[PDB]
Amino acid sequence: LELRLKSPVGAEPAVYPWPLPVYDKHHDAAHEIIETIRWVCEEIPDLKLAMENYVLIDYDTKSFESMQRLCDKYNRAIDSIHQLWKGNTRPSTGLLRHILQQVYNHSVTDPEPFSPEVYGETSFDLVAQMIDEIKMTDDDLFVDLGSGVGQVVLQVAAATNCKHHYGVEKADIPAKYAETMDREFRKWMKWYGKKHAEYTLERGDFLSEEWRERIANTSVIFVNNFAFGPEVDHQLKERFANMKEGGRIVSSKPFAPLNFRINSRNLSDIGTIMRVVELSPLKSWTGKPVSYYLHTIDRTILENYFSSLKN
Numbered sequence: 001l002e003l004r005l006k007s008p009v010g011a012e013p014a015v016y017p018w019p020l021p022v023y024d025k026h027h028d029a030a031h032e033i034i035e036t037i038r039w040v041c042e043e044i045p046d047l048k049l050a051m052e053n054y055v056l057i058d059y060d061t062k063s064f065e066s067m068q069r070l071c072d073k074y075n076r077a078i079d080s081i082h083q084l085w086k087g088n089t090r091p092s093t094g095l096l097r098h099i100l101q102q103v104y105n106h107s108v109t110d111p112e113p114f115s116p117e118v119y120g121e122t123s124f125d126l127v128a129q130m131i132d133e134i135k136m137t138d139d140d141l142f143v144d145l146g147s148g149v150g151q152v153v154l155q156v157a158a159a160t161n162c163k164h165h166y167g168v169e170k171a172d173i174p175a176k177y178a179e180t181m182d183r184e185f186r187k188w189m190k191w192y193g194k195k196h197a198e199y200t201l202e203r204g205d206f207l208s209e210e211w212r213e214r215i216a217n218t219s220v221i222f223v224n225n226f227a228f229g230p231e232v233d234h235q236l237k238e239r240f241a242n243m244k245e246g247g248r249i250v251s252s253k254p255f256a257p258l259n260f261r262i263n264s265r266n267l268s269d270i271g272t273i274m275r276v277v278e279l280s281p282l283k284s285w286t287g288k289p290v291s292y293y294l295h296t297i298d299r300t301i302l303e304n305y306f307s308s309l310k311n
Ligand SMILES: CNc1ccnc(Nc2ccc3cc(C)n(-c4ccccc4Oc4ccccc4)c3c2)n1
Pocket: 113, 114, 122, 123, 124, 126, 127, 144, 146, 147, 148, 149, 150, 151, 152, 222, 223, 224, 225, 226, 250, 251, 252, 290, 291, 292, 293
């Protein structure tokens, strides 16, 4: 009828119905259960000692009795550790990738580059590099513009100490799935006993009047602008022009040339008020040769040009 996994921190058990749900072609619920057990064993060294070696080696994902025996063995090992303990940190990057996968599989049940379906395999590591590079503190406010199902926001919230993390998505289908992703993330994080910063996944148009002041007051913007049209790009540069000095924008395509040279003919260009650098994990990376672009609000670019003319 069903499979149960006791939480290492005494939260409510994870309940899986049998037959287990079928995920996408290269993910399955049975291996999710097994990997969940292996991750909890890493978190708790005593759990490995309490558990008999054969349990995680010899199993049959296609047998209810076999899958039930595995869950029973883990649950009894958890109970022994809970007895031993009688007598809340940020998740590790490896655990976080697994949590995000689990959160996705439990949220998206119904049927092109960097698809949410393959986030863990093609996006996670690049996002993890960007988090390591773009140093964020408790004074920062993070916003992912066009956040989709909310994976980037969840990864950043589980990794940094920003005051708040926001995801804004306009499309009906991703924004609705993000509601489930949000609930599933909070639930699974509690189950493992892991800490995450505050975040909000919301439906809205980042080009709206409400969002103008919100963009102006954001210190760190992430924006996958790869598929943006020239009008969306033009309107976004106008929003960025209201940001504070030192405000940062991390994007998949640059908003200004990397080599911008201020002159009399290009004074209205966004390049007059922002520094732009191309960052790459390749500069021990072994994934895709993909770059990200860091823009920093700096009005001294414009100031020095005027001072140069007057002096
Ligand atoms: C990828 N999907 C989502 C979903 C929701 N939210 C965001 N946010 C977000 C914001 C800023 C950037 C900068 C980079 C490099 N990535 C990026 C990261 C991982 C993989 C690819 C990336 O970018 C692309 C995308 C397409 C083509 C080429 C590169 C960004 C992602 N991304």
